[PDB]
Amino acid sequence: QITLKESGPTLVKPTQTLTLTCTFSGFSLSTSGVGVAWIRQPPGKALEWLALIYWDNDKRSSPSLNNRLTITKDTSKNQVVLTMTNMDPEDTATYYCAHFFSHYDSSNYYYGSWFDPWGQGTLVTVSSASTKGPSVFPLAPSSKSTSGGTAALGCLVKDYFPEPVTVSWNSGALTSGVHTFPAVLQSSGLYSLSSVVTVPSSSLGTQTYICNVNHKPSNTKVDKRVEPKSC
Amino acid sequence: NLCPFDEVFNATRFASVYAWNRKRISNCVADYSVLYNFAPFFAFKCYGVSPTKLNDLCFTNVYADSFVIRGNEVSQIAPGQTGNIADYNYKLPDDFTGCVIAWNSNKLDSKVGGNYNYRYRLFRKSNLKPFERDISTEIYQAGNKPCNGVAGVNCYFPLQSYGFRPTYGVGHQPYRVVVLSFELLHAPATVCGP
Amino acid sequence: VQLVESGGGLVQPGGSLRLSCAASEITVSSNYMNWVRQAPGKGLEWVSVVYPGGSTFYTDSVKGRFTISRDNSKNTLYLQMNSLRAEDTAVYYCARESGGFPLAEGAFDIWGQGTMVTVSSASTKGPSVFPLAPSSKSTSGGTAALGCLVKDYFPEPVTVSWNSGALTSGVHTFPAVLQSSGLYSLSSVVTVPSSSLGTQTYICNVNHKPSNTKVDKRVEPKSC
Amino acid sequence: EIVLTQSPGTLSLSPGERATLSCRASQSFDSRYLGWYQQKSGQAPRLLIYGASSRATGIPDRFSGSGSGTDFTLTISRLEPEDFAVYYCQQFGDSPFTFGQGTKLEIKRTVAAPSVFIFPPSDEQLKSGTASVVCLLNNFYPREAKVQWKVDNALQSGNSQESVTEQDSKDSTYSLSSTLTLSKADYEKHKVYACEVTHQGLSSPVTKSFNRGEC
Amino acid sequence: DIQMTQSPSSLSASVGDRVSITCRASQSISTHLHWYQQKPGKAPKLLISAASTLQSGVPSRFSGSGSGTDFTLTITSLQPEDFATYYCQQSYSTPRGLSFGGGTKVEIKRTVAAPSVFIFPPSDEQLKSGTASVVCLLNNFYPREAKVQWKVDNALQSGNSQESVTEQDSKDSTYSLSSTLTLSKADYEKHKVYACEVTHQGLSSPVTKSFNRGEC
Ligand SMILES: *[C@@H]1O[C@H](CO)[C@@H](O)[C@H](O)[C@H]1NC(C)=O
């Protein structure tokens, strides 16, 4: 069993350079055929291989990104450092460091190779806007009497940066049907999501509705009251 | 004071055949037992000395040449052989004494995308003399017009890289070759067996 | 790059011949030079190679009786074929191996035009000329054909003309076939309308240059 | 560059039945260069098969691979409730090494209609200078749905945002929220705000609206 | 001893369409395969190097791909001057093993057409020396495939026929064919009626053309 963990700056400013350090345990960059690879996954897109460094300090990079990607290794500290320069806003992704190995069997037959354990992954973003606490707007159940006891009520957390914001409904006493939709990049490189809960209209004015919304990079801890608004 | 055959036969990075690596073994007791004790060696082969008589005689000025070649080019490392590497990379003399140790190294000298660290000479106007090395990377002129140091047509780079990949068949997979030369000479014999 | 050939011809089996390849703009001694043969109607076959350093290699069929050499003084490549057998009748090409701007290693990038070598005891002689008239019919759709059969000659090529070149439309010459007796024959036919069968007298001219046969034979329908 | 195309783009199969995935390569390479990886919801991808037929260590025998030339297939004989994820084919043939676009395995169920609800902005959001109204479509299957926004029964395009959530862990339905953002010059220049929804579970599209003034 | 095959043996194609021809080795040869083009009456010209590299001066419509045991040559817009024979050659085995492929022929595709079928007897002049040639001529038939058989009083004449076929013309892109029987004097003089049966794709049914020795 082997592990890999990535670390570095998760808030990288545009047209600047980032450095990511992957610390791995369970193996060392001295065994033949062992390498460390760096792969990235854009949000909502497929994976893309970035770089691969071998045990003998042989490095390979994607030809479309080899002009601005450097990869270095420290066997003593069991670390791999990926430096990437000249950032663009579309370079926001989640970066994994993964163990690369091959399987020969007693005759050097090469029964294939793989990317076995991947790191947990670091979500790195490229943008200019700095931190900003979310604005919470309560979203009111509509004016309906019963409708079969079916309703939804929520709160909208908009204009916040960076990811993520954690929303809890009634401090864990209301989790049935809490949809926290994935946040959407606004047109200004900013974040906005809705957190709603499905509740029956037969318990409108008797069951309390709160949303504790939390954002560590902005230290936003807002316990927003949601209540029924009539006409 | 054992001879450093372990470094020769266990080095992480061998040399390319055009710039084959040379090492002088002397003033040390050599146990060729360990050499044969290697199970996977696919070519423990030679001509002028019995394989079991290696430990039974004392030589002087032993030489070790290490390089990497294709699988099908191993047959060219032999006396009186013609070919590409025999004529332009590594020429064994006709009266050669000593012998050749070739083993498959696909696990080490091969990468998924291709290993381009191993290279060989393809162009040379004349054959190499025995045990002669050429490292001159000059634009080879296979034509009348002197291009004056720029590649193109009838001007080619003399060195070409093996594209060693792990799915290649036996014949184009990498092979590590160590040639030992036992050059007897009018001097106190140094390299003796146990 | 130009590679000009020379030395082809016809020989008796068990004979010998020498082929020459004069190069320009390249040096024969400084390149991998190959002789590659192609039989008439079959595919390419590699015959021999000579290295820049003078090493030579041959295919198995021509071992011993074929040798390759070079002359540095006038930059030529030579192929000496001895004990020639019937299987050596082919077109031979002088080719430069492992060249080209992207450096096509192991590939032939520059070729000569090739010489023709024939190995048979056919005893060179002249072709007989026979006329062929269509069916005795009035129009039958206005399609009749008349032909000149050229028989029993060696070697190729031969020239067949109709009315000494006055007729060139609708003429089909078929490639000559090697008879089991070691001779060659072909048929040269042409389709004309039946209404022009009478008013247009036709003559087939066969000029076989090596045997110096200049034979013109009349081509008119027959009476059955 | 070698391009690997997976098929189908989306795939839904209730537990118990047979799962088939295909990967076609633009060029031809050895079958030992292609592997299959599985990535779950919000997880790092984990190796599933290497060499196109060699099962990774610890992977159950339910996963098999078969490859030939430029056609590779991944077969799942018994697929369990925990076996629904995205599957990538990738190659080590030529640099750069490329993955496939992926294939999302989906939990099949009977068709259900999405509840459509509307929520207006708060007074604070009438104070911020930008007002957003959110339209929610919940409890539907399959994922395919369409929503169109209408300001005073006039179609809207390019002024709204969408966000669909992942499959639930208990009911396998989907949920979606679409926001419409406007200013005051637009929010108080009209009367009617409507969503018309077209879903596979609905025979006809449903138009549902609200008016700011009446409430 | 690296057997090397080409598929298909010959294909017919139009002008401007994409065409792919495949080369298969008996065993994996990495990328040591080269594609040559040879026009009739000329020497081959190297098109593709290393199974993927376009040569300098070759139009970009020629492309090569594949590796191991399967390789492909693809032409995007088949120009009218791209009709030639294409060979795949391997440089993998040994300095004495540069074998070539069978070769693929590319010719113009047109509509089917029925040949004129004519029978030509052994004329008296050639008969006077005991050497009789009888001819079955097929004129302007497409495609190249055709079947010709020889008939003598319902008997079948086999084992001594010669076939001469012309390559596609630049005017009508059809073919021509001649089948010839050579026999000595009494190997024809005794028998009575001589016919030729022909079968072509453009013909619904085989056609028999018969002539009498006695009549003419
Ligand atoms: C070669 O080196 C490896 C690693 O350093 C070692 O395990 C092995 O024992 C060495 N070979 C011999 C013959 O000692």
Resolution rounded to one decimal, in angstroms: 2.6
| Superfamily the domain D115-211 falls into | Immunoglobulins (2.60.40.10)
* Domain assignment present for B22: yes
Residue partners of A148: CB distance under 8 A and separation at least 6: none
Q: Name the helix (H) or strand (E) containing B52.
A: none
Asked if the Cβ–Cβ distance from B153 to E94 is below 8 Å, we say no
Q: Measuring CA to CA, which residue among B187, B193, B194, B181 is closest to residue B48?
A: B181
Residue whose token pair is 């929804």: D197
Closest atom of ligand 1 relative to the B34 alpha carbon? 13
Q: Domain containing B83: what range? A: 5-120+163-182
Token representation of residue A83: 């430096």
Which amino acid is it at E37?
Q
Instruction: Give CA separation, C172 vs C169, D12, E3, E137, in Å.
Output: 9, 66, 38, 11
Q: Between β-strands E33-38 and E45-49, what pairing exists: parallel, antiparallel or unpaired?
A: antiparallel
Distance CA E123, CA A187 (A): 94
Any idea what the Cα angle at residue C12 is, between residues C9 and C14, rounded to 5°?
115
Q: Name the helix (H) or strand (E) containing B6.
A: helix B5-10
Distance CA E162, CA C154 (A): 18
B10 lines ligand 1 (CB under 6 A): yes
Give the chain A residue whose CA is nearest to the CA of B165.
A110
Residue partners of E8: CB distance under 8 A and separation at least 6: E21, E104
Q: What's the N-to-C CA distance of chain E in angstroms?
A: 57
Asked if the Cβ–Cβ distance from D177 to A194 is below 8 Å, we say yes
Q: Are A139 and A154 in contact (CB under 8 A)?
A: yes
Question: CA of C174, closest CA in chain B: separation in Å?
Answer: 42
Fold of the domain spanning C2-119? Immunoglobulin-like (2.60.40)
Name the residue ranges covered by the structural domains of chain C. Answer: 2-119, 128-219
B167 lines ligand 1 (CB under 6 A): no
Residue nearest to atom 4 of ligand 1 (CA): B10
Q: Do chains B and A touch (3 or more CB pairs under 8 A)?
A: yes
Name the residue ranges covered by the structural domains of chain E. Answer: 4-108, 116-212
| Strand residues in chain C grouped as ranges (E) | 2-6, 9-11, 16-24, 32-38, 44-50, 56-58, 66-71, 76-82, 90-99, 104-111, 115-119, 128-132, 144-153, 159-162, 171-173, 177-178, 184-192, 202-208, 213-219
Q: Measuring CA to CA, which residue among A123, A100, A4 is closest to residue A49?
A: A100
Peptide bond into E8 cis (omega under 30): yes
Cα dihedral A124→A128→A129→A131 (10° resolution): 50
Distance CA C143, CA C148 (A): 17
Q: Are D150 and D164 in contact (CB under 8 A)?
A: no
Give the chain E residue whose CA is nearest to the CA of C48.
E96
B50 lines ligand 1 (CB under 6 A): no
From B7, B9, B10, the mutation candidate for ligand 1 (largest count of ligand atoms within 8 A of CB) is B10
Residue partners of D34: CB distance under 8 A and separation at least 6: D4, D23, D25, D51, D52, D67, D72, D89, D90, D91, D92, D93
How many C-beta neighbours within 10 Å does residue B136 have?
11
SS3 per residue for chain E = CCCEEEECCEEEECCCCCEEEEEEECCCCCCCEEEEEECCCCCCEEEEECCCEECCCCCCCEEEEEECCEEEEEECCCCCCCCCEEEEEECCCCCCCCCECCCEEEEECCCCECCEEEEECCCHHHHCCCEEEEEEEEEEEECCCEEEEEEECCEEECCCEEEEEECCCCCCCCEEEEEEEEEECHHHHCCCEEEEEEEECCCCCCEEEEEECCCC
Residue whose token pair is 């004989």: D77
Query: 3-state DSSP call for residue A38?
Result: strand
The neighbouring-strand residues paired with B121 are B159
Any idea what the Cα angle at residue D171 is, between residues D168 and D174, rounded to 5°?
50
Q: How many residues does chain C have?
A: 224
Name the residue ranges covered by the structural domains of chain A. Answer: 3-126, 135-226
Looking from the CA of C118 toward its CB, the CA atoms found within 13 Å total: 15
Residue nearest to atom 10 of ligand 1 (CA): B10
Please give the full DSSP string across A65-125, using - where no structure is assigned: TTTSEEEEEETTTTEEEEEE-S--GGG-EEEEEEEEEE---SS-----EEEEEE---EEEE
Distance CA A94, CA B104 (A): 40
Burial code (b: 16+ CB inside 10 Å, e: under 16) for B55-71 equals beeebbbbbbbbbbbbb
CATH number of the C128-219 domain: 2.60.40.10
Distance CA E32, CA E30 (A): 6
From B2, B5, B6, B35, the mutation candidate for ligand 1 (largest count of ligand atoms within 8 A of CB) is B6
Distance CA B123, CA C98 (A): 10
Fold of the domain spanning A3-126? Immunoglobulin-like (2.60.40)
Distance B11 CA to ligand 1 centre (A): 10
We find that the CATH architecture of domain D4-106 is Sandwich (2.60)
Give the chain D residue whose CA is nearest to the CA of B168.
D30
Distance CA A132, CA E216 (A): 109
Residue whose token pair is 């050229």: C150
Q: Which of B84, B153, B168 sits opposite E30 (nearest CB)?
A: B168
Distance B7 CA to ligand 1 centre (A): 9
Q: Are E123 and C132 in contact (CB under 8 A)?
A: yes
> CB-based contact (8 Å) between E94 and chain B?
yes
> CB-based contact (8 Å) between A114 and chain D?
yes
Q: Are A114 and D55 in contact (CB under 8 A)?
A: no
Q: Measuring CA to CA, which residue among C19, C162, C29 is closest to residue C92?
A: C19
Give the chain C residue whose CA is nearest to the CA of E165.
C174
Token representation of residue B179: 């040639």
Residue nearest to atom 13 of ligand 1 (CA): B6
Token representation of residue E83: 């009709």
Asked if the Cβ–Cβ distance from B166 to A110 is below 8 Å, we say yes
Mutate: best of D2, D97, D209, partner A, most A CBs <10 A: D97
Residue whose token pair is 């005991």: E130
Q: Which of E27, E31, E56 sits opposite B169 (nearest CB)?
A: E27
Closest atom of ligand 1 relative to the B38 alpha carbon? 13
Residue partners of C144: CB distance under 8 A and separation at least 6: C134, C135, C137, C191, C192, C193, C194, C197
Token representation of residue E30: 């990495």
**Given its phi and psi angles, is residue E16 left (phi above 0), alpha (psi -120 to 50 degrees) or beta?**
left
| Superfamily the domain E116-212 falls into | Immunoglobulins (2.60.40.10)
Asked if the Cβ–Cβ distance from A46 to D37 is below 8 Å, we say no
Q: Which of E126, E131, E215 sits opposite C224 (nearest CB)?
A: E215
Distance CA C223, CA C143 (A): 18
Which amino acid is it at D44?
A
Q: Which long-range contacts (CB under 8 A, 24 or more apart) does A76-81 make?
A: A77/A23, A78/A23, A78/A24, A78/A25, A78/A28, A78/A29, A79/A21, A79/A22, A79/A23, A79/A24, A80/A21, A80/A22, A80/A24, A80/A29, A80/A36, A80/A38, A80/A53, A81/A19, A81/A20, A81/A21, A81/A22
Residue partners of C109: CB distance under 8 A and separation at least 6: C96, C99, C100, E46, E55
CATH number of the E4-108 domain: 2.60.40.10
Distance CA B175, CA A197 (A): 67
Q: Measuring CA to CA, which residue among B64, A57, A113 is closest to residue D35?
A: A113
Residue partners of A11: CB distance under 8 A and separation at least 6: A125, A162, A217
Asked if the Cβ–Cβ distance from E30 to B163 is below 8 Å, we say yes
Residue whose token pair is 């001066």: E57
CATH entry, A135-226, from 1.10.3720.10, 2.60.40.10, 3.30.360.10, 3.20.20.140: 2.60.40.10
Q: How far is CA D145 from the centre of its chain?
A: 11
Q: What CATH number is attached to the domain comprising B39?
A: 3.30.70.1840
Q: Which of B152, B154, B160 sits opposite C105 (nearest CB)?
A: B160
Asked if the Cβ–Cβ distance from E68 to D30 is below 8 Å, we say yes
Which chains have at least 3 CB atom pairs separated by less than 8 Å from chain B? A, C, D, E
Asked if the Cβ–Cβ distance from E133 to C151 is below 8 Å, we say yes
Token representation of residue E70: 């399967």
Q: Name the helix (H) or strand (E) containing B84.
A: helix B84-88
Residue nearest to atom 6 of ligand 1 (CA): B10
Question: CA of B84, closest CA in chain C: separation in Å?
Answer: 9
Q: Measuring CA to CA, which residue among A70, A75, A86 is closest to residue A20?
A: A70
